[PDB]
Design a protein around this nucleic acid. Sequence first.
DNA 1: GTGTAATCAGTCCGCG
DNA 2: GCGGACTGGTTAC
Length: 901
Amino acid sequence: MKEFYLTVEQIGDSIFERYIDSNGRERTREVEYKPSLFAHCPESQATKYFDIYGKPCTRKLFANMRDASQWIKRMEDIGLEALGMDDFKLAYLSDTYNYEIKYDHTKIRVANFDIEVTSPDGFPEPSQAKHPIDAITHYDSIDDRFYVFDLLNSPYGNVEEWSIEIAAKLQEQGGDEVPSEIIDKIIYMPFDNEKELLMEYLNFWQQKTPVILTGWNVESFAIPYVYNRIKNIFGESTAKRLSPHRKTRVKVIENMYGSREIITLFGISVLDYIDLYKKFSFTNQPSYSLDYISEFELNVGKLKYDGPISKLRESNHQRYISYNIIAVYRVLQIDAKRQFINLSLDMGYYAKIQIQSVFSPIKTWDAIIFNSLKEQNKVIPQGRSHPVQPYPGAFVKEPIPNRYKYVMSFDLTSAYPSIIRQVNISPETIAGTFKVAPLHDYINAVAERPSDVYSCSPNGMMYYKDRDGVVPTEITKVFNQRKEHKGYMLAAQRNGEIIKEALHNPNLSVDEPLDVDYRFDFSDEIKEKIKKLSAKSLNEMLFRAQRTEVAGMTAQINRKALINGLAGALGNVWFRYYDLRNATAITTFGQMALQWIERKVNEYLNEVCGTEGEAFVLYGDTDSIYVSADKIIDKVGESKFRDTNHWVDFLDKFARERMEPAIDRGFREMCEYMNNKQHLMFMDREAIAGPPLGSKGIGGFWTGKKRYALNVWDMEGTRYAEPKLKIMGLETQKSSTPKAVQKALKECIRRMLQEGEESLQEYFKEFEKEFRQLNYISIASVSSANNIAKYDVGGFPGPKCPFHIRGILTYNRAIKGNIDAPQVVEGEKVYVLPLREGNPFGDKCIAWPSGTEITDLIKDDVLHWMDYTVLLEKTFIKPLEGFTSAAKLDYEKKASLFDMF
DNA sequence: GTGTAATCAGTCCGCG
DNA sequence: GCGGACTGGTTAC
Ligand SMILES: [Ca+2]
Ligand SMILES: [Ca+2]
Ligand SMILES: [Ca+2]
Ligand SMILES: [Ca+2]
Ligand SMILES: [Ca+2]
């Protein structure tokens, strides 16, 4: 097989590499790698190396990496550019793996672990590690085993061995319900002292040294705790055995405010699952506890135990260990679904970077571009310092707030990457500038044509047309990958809808789900078999279809994010290819494209309707247009349609056969006007929206920019069994909005769009009467809590104290004296409730850690003093008033003459 | 740990 | 009470 790296490090003048050899074996080596860098040289000097602008370079080969680094500094002292890849491990990988890497995930040791630490005096700080580690569960992907290290004897209690038999039993048998599918995969090791536990853990680690190390909060808790605890008991040298090269760095993270300590383990790639989830999931959660995320992702119930975790080991060691094992498994289940580890390996190996560098699109693109250029013997420019400067972005149309009955939307496929490709925007393709007219003049095609030679953006930039830039070249490759995966995702989605339809008529039989590939549209034969299946089999198939869709989603959306990040990186001063001319070329072209096509669509529809000056485009954001279809429907007449699906077909056909060709003609003209390299503006229909046929539903409404709701029947070619709400920006979509309030507001919107004013009024009246019964967590607001200390003046709110910070200070006073009772953590999220006048907490609100029940000793008082009236007005009525006034609807029935009877 | 545009909640305080 | 200046936080692209 072809070799591939596992990890790479620079340690002094040595590259330390773990890799899989041609026989599939893991090996380690130390290489005295001699790096090359580059200097510009005279024209008269024969060379094969050129910088990206075509200027010749001489290669300088250094005796070692430190000599190369020292040369960089002296070049700075002289005032000359030192060219080439200054991150020598990336150069090493480029030399050692000079081919497209094919990796075998089954040979990569992926370790998933979690530790337990009993602490009678608050949260166990990893920097101090003053308490015994009393459990470790470590899952190894190569063995497919859960290794459980269990401390039976501690200063905080001596306990009995954990029983696998009890662990397997149902909760109703007194068991822990450890899933049957992992029972046979547990290797359980009890220890009568912590020293032997840790020594054996380290011997185990040596035997089965993780390549990828993951788990939940492992980077911020488990890794530093384990490292520091071993360090405290045995000394530094023993702790460094966590690194296969015995090198670690105690590395401090610097961001917005304050700092925290992480341990870099050389020769390991740590991908904390919480960080993977935050970067790759495109959710924003009210809480990031594993309980919370597991329930959301997998629909598993919260791990239930009595009393605080600080007393769980002594009171119920059996459950204590079972829950540690289950916690590790839940992360594996989340990954089975989301496939973020797979994604990281794919992207890491593609770029030829340390796998953990997938968190940095700048590092990722730096490596992609370096490897691409190196292939042609080209030499990358040196990174330079630049001042941070603001620059302009997208155009967003101001919508007239209103209901909108029938709506068809369209937007550009991969807008910014397509602009880069079309215009040929790249550091080395800059051809010069032209004299810019106001944007309006380009939009209306009255400005002088910018160039007859070069490809142009309305910001004044010109680009070469003879050859593709490296940025267009490399962005195209990842775009094509994105396109492939999105194809699979949409097929799985369409397949899902077929199953949902079939589920209206399940068969009374006993059978099996069909063995099919959900990434491809079901054949006619498959469709026929599905119509004969039982509900049980159909439901299993739907589950599998949806899992396939999720897998496609992960693969496609994060590839989209990477290519969009390249466009963004052009405007970040740390990017090697930072250039505000290029960043702005993209954004300004985008502004033109949207407004150009708005004009073209209006002109087209006025023509086919025989009107003049009528605005069919009601809204747009960045690269999208929303077109009112009322006049199109009315030209045929609502009475001519058999059912909702009939007019949906009609608009679908109209968009595909009339609008899109008109849109395409409009964009080809714009391409020619800007003299672009290649027409790549592809604005396909997104949504077909409207009320159910014959209903009093309003179909859709906008309250303002980035705030709207649509009742959608078909989304990018997916025809839904049931209409789906596309809601953007409204409170139903915000993690800050209470969960029950999101739900209630969404039902109000559903009723508005699908059923009408009377239905909305009926629901509002019920919610208002019943809502005080809702669980307090479900009606609590959510906020991130930064700078708690800044606003804390002797335990009370300082000037300009934010509402949620005020709540935290209230909480702090209320729990004063406890070494127990959860502390609010700087930077994490809190639930927030308003408090009625004259409450015993002495302020107007209280806040506590999100994803948790508020501590027992104040829970009762919070419940008693919760201000339901303020909560309702602020989170529910105020937003609903905004929705209904925009839609010209009343949420409460107004008086009428009929009341006289 | 790529980017800008945008609405909103809340504080403070003016507005005769 | 609403709005502007401001901070804080979050979402649409
Ligand atoms: Ca735990
Ligand atoms: Ca788009
Ligand atoms: Ca599309
Ligand atoms: Ca059937
Ligand atoms: Ca869009």
